[PDB]
PDB file of C-alpha atoms in Angstrom:
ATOM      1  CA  UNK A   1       1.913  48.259 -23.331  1.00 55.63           C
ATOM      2  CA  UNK A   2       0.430  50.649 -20.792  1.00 53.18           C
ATOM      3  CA  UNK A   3      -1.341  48.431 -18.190  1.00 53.59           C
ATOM      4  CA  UNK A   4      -3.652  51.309 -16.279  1.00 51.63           C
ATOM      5  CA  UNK A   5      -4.490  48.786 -13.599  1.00 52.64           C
ATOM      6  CA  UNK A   6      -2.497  45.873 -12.094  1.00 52.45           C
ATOM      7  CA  UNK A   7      -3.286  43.806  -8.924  1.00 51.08           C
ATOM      8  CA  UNK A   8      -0.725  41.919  -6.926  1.00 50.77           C
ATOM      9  CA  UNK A   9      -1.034  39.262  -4.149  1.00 49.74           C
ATOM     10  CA  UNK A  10       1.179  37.951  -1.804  1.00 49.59           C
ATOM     11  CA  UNK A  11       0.925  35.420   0.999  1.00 44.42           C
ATOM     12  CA  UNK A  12       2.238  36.469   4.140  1.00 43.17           C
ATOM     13  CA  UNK A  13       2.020  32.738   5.812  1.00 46.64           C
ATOM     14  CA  UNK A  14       4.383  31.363   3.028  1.00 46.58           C
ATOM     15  CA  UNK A  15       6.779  34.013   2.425  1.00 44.26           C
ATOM     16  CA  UNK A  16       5.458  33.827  -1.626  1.00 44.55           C
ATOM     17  CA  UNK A  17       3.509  35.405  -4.370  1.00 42.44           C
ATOM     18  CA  UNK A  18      -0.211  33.777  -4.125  1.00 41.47           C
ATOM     19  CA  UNK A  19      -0.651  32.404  -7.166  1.00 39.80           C
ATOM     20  CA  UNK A  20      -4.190  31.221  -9.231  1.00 37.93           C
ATOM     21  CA  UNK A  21      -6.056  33.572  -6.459  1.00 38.79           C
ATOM     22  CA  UNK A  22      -9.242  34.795  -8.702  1.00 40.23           C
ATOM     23  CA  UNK A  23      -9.599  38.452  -8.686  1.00 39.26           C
ATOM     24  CA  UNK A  24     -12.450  40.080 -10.267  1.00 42.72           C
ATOM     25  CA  UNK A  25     -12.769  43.967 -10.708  1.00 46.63           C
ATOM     26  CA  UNK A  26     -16.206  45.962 -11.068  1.00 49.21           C
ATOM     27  CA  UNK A  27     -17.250  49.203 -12.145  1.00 48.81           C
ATOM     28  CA  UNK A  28     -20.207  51.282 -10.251  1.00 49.85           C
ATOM     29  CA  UNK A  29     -23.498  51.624 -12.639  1.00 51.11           C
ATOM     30  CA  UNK A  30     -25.549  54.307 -12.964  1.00 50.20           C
ATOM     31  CA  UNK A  31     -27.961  52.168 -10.475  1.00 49.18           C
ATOM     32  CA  UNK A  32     -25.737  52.115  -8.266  1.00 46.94           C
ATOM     33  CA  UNK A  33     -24.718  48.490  -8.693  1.00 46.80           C
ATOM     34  CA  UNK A  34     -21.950  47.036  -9.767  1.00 44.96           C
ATOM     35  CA  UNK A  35     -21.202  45.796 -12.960  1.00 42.53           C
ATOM     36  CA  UNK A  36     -18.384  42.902 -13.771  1.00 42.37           C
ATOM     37  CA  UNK A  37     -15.492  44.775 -15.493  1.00 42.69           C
ATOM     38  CA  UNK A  38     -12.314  42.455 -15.946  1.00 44.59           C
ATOM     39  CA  UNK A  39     -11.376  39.063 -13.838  1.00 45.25           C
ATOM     40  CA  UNK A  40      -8.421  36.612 -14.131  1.00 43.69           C
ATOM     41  CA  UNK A  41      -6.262  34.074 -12.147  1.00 43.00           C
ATOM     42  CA  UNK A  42      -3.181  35.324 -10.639  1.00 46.80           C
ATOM     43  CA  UNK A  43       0.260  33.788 -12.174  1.00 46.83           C
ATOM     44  CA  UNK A  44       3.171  32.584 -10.652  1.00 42.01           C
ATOM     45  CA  UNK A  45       4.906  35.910  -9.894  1.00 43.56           C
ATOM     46  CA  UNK A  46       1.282  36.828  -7.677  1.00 44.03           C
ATOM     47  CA  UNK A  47       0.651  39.198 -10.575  1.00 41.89           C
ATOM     48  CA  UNK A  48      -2.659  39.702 -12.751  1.00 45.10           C
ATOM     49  CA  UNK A  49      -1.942  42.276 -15.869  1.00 43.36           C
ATOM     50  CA  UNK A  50      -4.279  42.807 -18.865  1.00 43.70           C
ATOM     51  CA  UNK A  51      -6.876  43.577 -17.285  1.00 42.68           C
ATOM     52  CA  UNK A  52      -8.198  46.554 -18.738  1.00 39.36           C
ATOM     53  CA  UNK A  53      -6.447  49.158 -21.697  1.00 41.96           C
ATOM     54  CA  UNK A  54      -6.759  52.902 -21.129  1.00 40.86           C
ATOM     55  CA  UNK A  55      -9.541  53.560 -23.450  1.00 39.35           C
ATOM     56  CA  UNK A  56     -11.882  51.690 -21.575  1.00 39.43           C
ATOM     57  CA  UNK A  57     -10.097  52.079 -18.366  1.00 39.07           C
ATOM     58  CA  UNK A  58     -12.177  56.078 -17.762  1.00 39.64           C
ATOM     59  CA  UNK A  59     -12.976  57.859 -14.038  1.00 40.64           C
ATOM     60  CA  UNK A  60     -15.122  56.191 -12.227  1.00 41.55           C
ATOM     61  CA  UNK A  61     -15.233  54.185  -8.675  1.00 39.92           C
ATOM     62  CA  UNK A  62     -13.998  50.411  -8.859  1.00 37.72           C
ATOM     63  CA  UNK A  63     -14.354  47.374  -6.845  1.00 35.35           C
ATOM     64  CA  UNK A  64     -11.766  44.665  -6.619  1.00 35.24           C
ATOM     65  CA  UNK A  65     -12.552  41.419  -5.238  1.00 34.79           C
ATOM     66  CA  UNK A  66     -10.244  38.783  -4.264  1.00 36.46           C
ATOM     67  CA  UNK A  67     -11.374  35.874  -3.607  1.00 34.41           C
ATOM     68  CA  UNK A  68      -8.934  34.771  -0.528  1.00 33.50           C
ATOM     69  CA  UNK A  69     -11.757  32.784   0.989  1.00 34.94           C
ATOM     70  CA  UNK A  70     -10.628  29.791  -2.054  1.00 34.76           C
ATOM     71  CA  UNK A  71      -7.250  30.309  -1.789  1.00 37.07           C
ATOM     72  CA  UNK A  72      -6.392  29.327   2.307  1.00 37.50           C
ATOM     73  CA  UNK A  73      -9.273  26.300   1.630  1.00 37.95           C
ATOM     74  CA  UNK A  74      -6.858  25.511  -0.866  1.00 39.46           C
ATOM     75  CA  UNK A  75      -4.269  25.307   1.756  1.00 38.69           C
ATOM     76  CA  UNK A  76      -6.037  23.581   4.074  1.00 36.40           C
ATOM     77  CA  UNK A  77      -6.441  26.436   6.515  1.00 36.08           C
ATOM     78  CA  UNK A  78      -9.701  28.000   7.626  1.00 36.07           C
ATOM     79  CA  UNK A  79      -9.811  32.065   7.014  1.00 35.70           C
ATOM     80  CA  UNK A  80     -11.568  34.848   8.409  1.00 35.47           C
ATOM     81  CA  UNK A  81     -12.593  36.339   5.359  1.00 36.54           C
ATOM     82  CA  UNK A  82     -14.995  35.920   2.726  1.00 36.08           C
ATOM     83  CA  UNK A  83     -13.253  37.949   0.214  1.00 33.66           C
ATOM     84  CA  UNK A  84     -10.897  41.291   0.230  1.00 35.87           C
ATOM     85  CA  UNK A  85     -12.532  44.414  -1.619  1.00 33.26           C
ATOM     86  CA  UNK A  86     -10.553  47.351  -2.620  1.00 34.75           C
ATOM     87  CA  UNK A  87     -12.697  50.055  -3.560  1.00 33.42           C
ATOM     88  CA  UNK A  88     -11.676  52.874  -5.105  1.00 35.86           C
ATOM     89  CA  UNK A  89     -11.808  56.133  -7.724  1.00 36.08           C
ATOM     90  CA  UNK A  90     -10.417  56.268 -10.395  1.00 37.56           C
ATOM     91  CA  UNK A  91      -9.105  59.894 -11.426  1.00 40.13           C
ATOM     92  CA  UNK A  92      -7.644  61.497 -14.602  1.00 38.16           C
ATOM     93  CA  UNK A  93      -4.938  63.830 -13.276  1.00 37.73           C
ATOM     94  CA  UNK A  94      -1.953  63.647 -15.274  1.00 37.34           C
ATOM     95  CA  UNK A  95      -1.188  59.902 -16.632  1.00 35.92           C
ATOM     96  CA  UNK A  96      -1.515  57.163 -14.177  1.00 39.21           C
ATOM     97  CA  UNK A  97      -0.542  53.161 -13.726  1.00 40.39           C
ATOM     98  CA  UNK A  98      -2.063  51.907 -10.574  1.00 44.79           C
ATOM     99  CA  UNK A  99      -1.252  48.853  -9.012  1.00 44.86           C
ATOM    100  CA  UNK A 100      -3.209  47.431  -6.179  1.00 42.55           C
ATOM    101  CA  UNK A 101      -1.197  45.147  -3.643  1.00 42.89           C
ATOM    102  CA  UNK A 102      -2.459  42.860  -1.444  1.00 41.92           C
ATOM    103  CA  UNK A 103      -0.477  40.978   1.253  1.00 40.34           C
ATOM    104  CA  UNK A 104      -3.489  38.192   3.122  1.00 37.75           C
ATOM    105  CA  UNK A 105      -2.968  36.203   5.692  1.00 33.34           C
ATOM    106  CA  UNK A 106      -6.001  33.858   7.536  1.00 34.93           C
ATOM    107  CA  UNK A 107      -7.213  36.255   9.433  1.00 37.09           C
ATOM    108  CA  UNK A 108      -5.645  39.603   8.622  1.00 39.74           C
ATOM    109  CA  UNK A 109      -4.704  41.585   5.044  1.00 34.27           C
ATOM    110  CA  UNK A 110      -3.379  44.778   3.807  1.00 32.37           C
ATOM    111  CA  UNK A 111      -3.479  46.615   1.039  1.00 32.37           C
ATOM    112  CA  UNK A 112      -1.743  49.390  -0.787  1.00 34.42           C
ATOM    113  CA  UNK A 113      -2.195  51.267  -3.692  1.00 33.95           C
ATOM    114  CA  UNK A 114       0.999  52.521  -5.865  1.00 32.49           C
ATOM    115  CA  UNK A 115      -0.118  54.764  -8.452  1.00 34.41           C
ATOM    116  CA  UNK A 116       3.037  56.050 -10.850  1.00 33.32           C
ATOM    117  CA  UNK A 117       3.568  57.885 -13.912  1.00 32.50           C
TER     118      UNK A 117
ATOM    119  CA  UNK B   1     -20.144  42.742  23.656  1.00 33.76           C
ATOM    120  CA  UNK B   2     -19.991  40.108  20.504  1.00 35.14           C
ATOM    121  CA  UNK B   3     -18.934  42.369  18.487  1.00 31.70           C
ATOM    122  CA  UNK B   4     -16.425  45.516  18.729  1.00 36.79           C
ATOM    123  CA  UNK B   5     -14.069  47.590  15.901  1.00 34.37           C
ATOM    124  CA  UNK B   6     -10.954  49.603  16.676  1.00 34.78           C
ATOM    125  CA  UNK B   7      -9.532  51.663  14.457  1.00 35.06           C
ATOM    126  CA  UNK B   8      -6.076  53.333  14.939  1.00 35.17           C
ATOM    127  CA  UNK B   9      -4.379  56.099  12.304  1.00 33.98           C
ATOM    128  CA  UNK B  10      -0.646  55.197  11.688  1.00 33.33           C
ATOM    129  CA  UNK B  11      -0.101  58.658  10.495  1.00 32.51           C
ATOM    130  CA  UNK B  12      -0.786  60.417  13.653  1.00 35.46           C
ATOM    131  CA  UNK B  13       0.161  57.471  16.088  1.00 38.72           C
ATOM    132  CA  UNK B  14      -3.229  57.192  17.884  1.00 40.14           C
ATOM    133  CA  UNK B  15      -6.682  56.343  17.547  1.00 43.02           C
ATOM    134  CA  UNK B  16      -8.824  57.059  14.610  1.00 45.73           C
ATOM    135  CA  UNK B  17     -11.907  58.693  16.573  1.00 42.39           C
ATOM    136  CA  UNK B  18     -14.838  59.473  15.221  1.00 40.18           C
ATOM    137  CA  UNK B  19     -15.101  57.567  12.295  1.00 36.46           C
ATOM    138  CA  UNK B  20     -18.731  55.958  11.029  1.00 37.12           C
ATOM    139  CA  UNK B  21     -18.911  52.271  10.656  1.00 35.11           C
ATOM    140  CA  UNK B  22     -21.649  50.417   9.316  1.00 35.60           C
ATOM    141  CA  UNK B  23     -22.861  46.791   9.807  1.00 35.30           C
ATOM    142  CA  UNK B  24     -24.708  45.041   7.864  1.00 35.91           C
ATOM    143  CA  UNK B  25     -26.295  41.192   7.276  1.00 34.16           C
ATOM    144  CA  UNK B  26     -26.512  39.251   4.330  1.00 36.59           C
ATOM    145  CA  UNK B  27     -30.462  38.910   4.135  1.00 34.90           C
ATOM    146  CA  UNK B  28     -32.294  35.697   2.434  1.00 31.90           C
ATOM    147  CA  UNK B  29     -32.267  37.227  -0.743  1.00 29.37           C
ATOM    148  CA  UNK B  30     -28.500  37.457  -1.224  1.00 30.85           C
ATOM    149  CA  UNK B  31     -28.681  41.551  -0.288  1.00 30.20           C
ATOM    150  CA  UNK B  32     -26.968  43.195   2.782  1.00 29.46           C
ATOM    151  CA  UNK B  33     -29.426  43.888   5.496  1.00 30.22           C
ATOM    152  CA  UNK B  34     -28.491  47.491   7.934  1.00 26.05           C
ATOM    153  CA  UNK B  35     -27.870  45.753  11.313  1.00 28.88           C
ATOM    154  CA  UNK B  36     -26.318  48.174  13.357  1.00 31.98           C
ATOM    155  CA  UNK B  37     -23.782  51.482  12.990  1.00 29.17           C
ATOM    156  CA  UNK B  38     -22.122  54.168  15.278  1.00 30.39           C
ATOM    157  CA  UNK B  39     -18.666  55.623  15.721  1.00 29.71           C
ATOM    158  CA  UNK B  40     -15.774  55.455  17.048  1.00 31.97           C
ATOM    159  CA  UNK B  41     -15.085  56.946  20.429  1.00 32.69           C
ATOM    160  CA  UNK B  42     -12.159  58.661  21.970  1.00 32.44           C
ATOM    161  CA  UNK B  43      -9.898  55.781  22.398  1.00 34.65           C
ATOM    162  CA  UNK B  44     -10.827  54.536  18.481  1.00 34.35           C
ATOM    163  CA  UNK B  45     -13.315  51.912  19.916  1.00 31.97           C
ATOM    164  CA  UNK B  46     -17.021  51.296  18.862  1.00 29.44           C
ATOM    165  CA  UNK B  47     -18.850  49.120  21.357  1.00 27.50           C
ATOM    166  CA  UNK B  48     -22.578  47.895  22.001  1.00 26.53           C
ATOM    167  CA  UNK B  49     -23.268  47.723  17.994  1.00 28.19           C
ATOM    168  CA  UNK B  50     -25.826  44.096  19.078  1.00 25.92           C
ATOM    169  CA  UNK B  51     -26.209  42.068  22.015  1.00 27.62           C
ATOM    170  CA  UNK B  52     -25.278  38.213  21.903  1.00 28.89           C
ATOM    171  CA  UNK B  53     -29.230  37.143  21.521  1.00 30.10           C
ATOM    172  CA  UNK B  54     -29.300  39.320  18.149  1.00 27.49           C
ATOM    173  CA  UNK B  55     -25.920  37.877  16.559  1.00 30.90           C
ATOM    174  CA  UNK B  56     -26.977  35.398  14.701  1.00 30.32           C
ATOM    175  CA  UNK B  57     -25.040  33.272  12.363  1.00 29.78           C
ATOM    176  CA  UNK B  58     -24.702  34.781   8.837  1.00 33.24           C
ATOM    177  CA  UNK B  59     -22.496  36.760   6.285  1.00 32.76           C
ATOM    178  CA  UNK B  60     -22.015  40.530   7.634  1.00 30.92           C
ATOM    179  CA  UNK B  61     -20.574  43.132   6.795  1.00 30.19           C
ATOM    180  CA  UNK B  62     -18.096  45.382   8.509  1.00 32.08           C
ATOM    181  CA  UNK B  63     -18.002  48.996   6.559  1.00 32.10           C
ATOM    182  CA  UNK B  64     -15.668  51.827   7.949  1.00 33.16           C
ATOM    183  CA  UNK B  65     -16.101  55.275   6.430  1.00 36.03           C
ATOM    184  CA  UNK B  66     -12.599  55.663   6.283  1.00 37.54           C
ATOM    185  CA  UNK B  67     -13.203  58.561   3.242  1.00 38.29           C
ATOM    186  CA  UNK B  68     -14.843  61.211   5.049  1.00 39.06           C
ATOM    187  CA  UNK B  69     -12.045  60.170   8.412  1.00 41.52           C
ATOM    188  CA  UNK B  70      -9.294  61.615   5.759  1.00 43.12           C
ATOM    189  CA  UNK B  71     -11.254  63.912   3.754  1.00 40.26           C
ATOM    190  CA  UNK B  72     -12.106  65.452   7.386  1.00 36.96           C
ATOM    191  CA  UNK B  73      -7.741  65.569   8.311  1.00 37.34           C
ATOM    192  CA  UNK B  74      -7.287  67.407   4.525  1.00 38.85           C
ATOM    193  CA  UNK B  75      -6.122  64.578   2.941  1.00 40.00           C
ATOM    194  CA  UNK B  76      -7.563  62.612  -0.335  1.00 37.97           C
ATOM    195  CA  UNK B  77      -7.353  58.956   0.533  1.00 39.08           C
ATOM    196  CA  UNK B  78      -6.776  55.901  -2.193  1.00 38.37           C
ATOM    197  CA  UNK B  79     -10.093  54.134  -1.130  1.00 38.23           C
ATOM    198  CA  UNK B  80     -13.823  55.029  -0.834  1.00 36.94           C
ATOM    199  CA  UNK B  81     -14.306  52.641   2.743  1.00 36.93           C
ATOM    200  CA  UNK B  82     -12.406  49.739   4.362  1.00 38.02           C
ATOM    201  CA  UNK B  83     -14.887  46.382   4.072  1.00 35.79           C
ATOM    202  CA  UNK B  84     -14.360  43.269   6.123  1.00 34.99           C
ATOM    203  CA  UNK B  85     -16.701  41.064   4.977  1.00 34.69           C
ATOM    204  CA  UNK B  86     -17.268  37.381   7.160  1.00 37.42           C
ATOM    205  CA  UNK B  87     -18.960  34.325   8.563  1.00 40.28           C
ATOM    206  CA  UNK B  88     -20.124  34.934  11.942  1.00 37.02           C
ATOM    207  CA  UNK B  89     -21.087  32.114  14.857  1.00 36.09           C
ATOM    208  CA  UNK B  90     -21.198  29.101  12.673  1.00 37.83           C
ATOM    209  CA  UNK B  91     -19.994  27.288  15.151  1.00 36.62           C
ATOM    210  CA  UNK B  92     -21.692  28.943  18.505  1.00 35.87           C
ATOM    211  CA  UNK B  93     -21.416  32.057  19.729  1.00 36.51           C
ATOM    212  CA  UNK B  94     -17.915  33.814  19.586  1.00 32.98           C
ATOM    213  CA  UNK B  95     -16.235  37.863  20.732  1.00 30.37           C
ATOM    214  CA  UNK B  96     -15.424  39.446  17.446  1.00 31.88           C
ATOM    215  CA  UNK B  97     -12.925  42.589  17.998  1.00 34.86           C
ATOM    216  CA  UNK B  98     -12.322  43.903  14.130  1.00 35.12           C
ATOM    217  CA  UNK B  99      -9.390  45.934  14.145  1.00 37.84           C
ATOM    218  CA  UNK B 100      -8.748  48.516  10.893  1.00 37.45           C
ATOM    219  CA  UNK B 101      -4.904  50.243  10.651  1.00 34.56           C
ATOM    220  CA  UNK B 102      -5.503  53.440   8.510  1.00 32.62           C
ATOM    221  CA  UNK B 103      -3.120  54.753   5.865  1.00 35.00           C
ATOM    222  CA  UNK B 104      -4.224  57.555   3.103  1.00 33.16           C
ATOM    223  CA  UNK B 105      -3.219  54.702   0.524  1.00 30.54           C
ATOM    224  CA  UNK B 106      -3.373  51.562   2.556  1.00 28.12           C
ATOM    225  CA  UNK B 107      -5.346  49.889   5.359  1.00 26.51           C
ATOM    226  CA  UNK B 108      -4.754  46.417   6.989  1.00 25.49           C
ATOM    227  CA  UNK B 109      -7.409  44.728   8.956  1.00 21.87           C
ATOM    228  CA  UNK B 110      -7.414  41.974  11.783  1.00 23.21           C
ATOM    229  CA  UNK B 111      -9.587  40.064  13.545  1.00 24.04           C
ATOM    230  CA  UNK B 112      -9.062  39.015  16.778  1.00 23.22           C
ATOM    231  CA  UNK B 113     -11.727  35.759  17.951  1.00 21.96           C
ATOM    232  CA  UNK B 114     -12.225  34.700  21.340  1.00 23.79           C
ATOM    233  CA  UNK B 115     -14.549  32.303  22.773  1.00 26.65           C
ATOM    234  CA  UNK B 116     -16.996  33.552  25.358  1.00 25.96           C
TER     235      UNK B 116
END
């Protein structure tokens, strides 16, 4: 099925997907706040799909929140971070997938967006 | 200086000047305080944002504007702002630099901790 929105994770310390990291995605209200959207555990390949289908899935700006604080306690090793937020519109314009990628380490992360057809 | 942010733009190979960045503190009741904003200078650097006797221990918040820094350079960037969200001097008083890499679809941040 089409998947509008998928979010991977990787960990750059172990060489490895980062799997059970929670994620949880948000959608700006009216007030200006954010209200809780979709959530889930990474799997085993890093990756976190179902999230969202396209009918519900319409424009608007989007917060996701990883919660990488969790994941390097889990590991034993003290992070920087509190969380990683990706923030972000989302725009009709021709048929879209995104997929938002996220490579943490303790005290340093990236992240990319690939949006395709 | 406790605190400093550098931002660099790895499409043009050189600092990202001029951009707005926003601090701010979680307050008692769980909502982010302002504590302190400016922008980036010439050489991508934002300096003398507080002063070690106002750095308190607490949950801030690191916003760049990195938007309007590509909406300015005509291009339409993935994300609305960069946000580096962290515990600061829980354990005494430390340097904070926060360094942000820009891409129109991807940003990486660091932070680089040194003890006074």
């Amino acid at each position: 099925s089409k998947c509008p929105l998928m979010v991977k994770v990787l960990d750059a310390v172990r060489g490895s997907p980062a799997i059970n990291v929670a994620v949880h995605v948000f959608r700006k209200a009216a007030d200006d706040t954010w209200e809780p959207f979709a959530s889930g555990k990474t799997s085993e390949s890093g990756e976190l799909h179902g999230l969202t289908t396209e009918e519900e899935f319409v424009e608007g700006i989007y917060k996701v929140e990883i919660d990488t604080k969790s994941y390097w306690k889990a590991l034993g090793i003290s992070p920087f971070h509190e969380h990683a937020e990706v923030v972000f519109t989302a725009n009709d314009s021709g048929p879209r997938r995104y997929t938002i990628a996220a490579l943490l380490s303790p005290y340093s992360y990236s992240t990319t967006a690939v949006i395709t057809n």
